[PDB]
Design a protein around this ligand. Sequence first.
Ligand SMILES: O=C(O)C1=C[C@H](O)[C@@H](OS(=O)(=O)O)[C@H](O[C@H]2[C@H](O)[C@@H](NS(=O)(=O)O)[C@@H](O)O[C@@H]2COS(=O)(=O)O)O1
Ligand code: NAG
Length: 346
Amino acid sequence: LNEDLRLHLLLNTSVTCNDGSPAGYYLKESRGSRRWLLFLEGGWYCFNRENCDSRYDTMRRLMSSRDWPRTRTGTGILSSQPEENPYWWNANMVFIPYCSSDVWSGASSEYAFMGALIIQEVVRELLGRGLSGAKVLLLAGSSAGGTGVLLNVDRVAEQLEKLGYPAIQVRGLADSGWFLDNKQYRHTDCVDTITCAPTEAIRRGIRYWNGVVPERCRRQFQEGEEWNCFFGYKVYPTLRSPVFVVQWLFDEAQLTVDNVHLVQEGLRLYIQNLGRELRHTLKDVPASFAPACLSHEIIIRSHWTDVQVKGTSLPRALHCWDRSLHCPVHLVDSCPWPHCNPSCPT
Ligand SMILES: O=C(O)C1=C[C@H](O)[C@@H](OS(=O)(=O)O)[C@H](O[C@H]2[C@H](O)[C@@H](NS(=O)(=O)O)[C@@H](O)O[C@@H]2COS(=O)(=O)O)O1
Ligand SMILES: *[C@@H]1O[C@H](CO)[C@@H](O)[C@H](O)[C@H]1NC(C)=O
């Protein structure tokens, strides 16, 4: 079937997944479009050797390209089906698998952590396949990929300028990558990946990965405090590129790193207060879609068309935003408990 995205393993074999196998990207071109959607996959991270070894046994797909299929079907925002992707179905579609376990921050050649270099390489190869004629490059991503967008969107804009392609408009779409460096509901020592407090996880990770953060955010904090720049509300104010933020107010990954296990009155208040704090961080982000749901990720799920805030679908909010850069803003739920929005996914 001609709508499948096809796998290209990177020609520069020194840019690799964790285990040294080549990184790569899936692509399907669309002749009648100047719009490029480049999606960064997510799936947590690993911040020390012991935890990376465990991940390599249990989730090898996220550390290696050995078994990646030669094709994949685009879903959600990467779908070519009009009913599934009403405005952008005809776009040039790219899926970049996540095999670096570094929130796309690794910038140096044990395990290799090369996420930032993988993005740089994919952009380089795409230029020869038609990216050089693009009007819009939307760097999109879910979960660790959504954080990856915040970390890389301005680096891609600068890359394209440097290479001599200044007319391409680089923009970002961060889905489920806007986290709070908050106090846990119940303290736990940083041992396992999924329950390690967000502040400590990144403090450890950035050193282990030799990770890099955006230049504009790095200069705001003291040398050694670059971990700050992994948190959306800290990185966002200094971005040069336009970025649309999609974020469930009660994100399941946030609740997990906060050591919440799912209700007593103390936990109800903790969870309610999370939604409030998140809402506060989005107060001055007009390009936002933030429903009051307990969920995680949305933009490559087939049902992304069905979620609404203030009578507006997510595809429509994105179309409205695109058009405003060439129908409403700050689509953040006012209702204050998880799943108060009738369109929340099951
Ligand atoms: O509408 C299209 O996307 C499209 C229309 C053409 O019928 C077809 O060209 S061809 O019949 O002359 O080959 C065009 O082919 C693309 C092909 O889909 C691409 N495959 S991909 O890399 O997996 O996306 C690629 O091979 O480029 C072909 C040429 O496209 S062009 O550069 O726009 O002419 O698809
Ligand atoms: C290939 O990738 C490696 C690792 O990032 C880099 O050192 C090397 O210079 C790259 N080759 C190029 C850009 O030709």
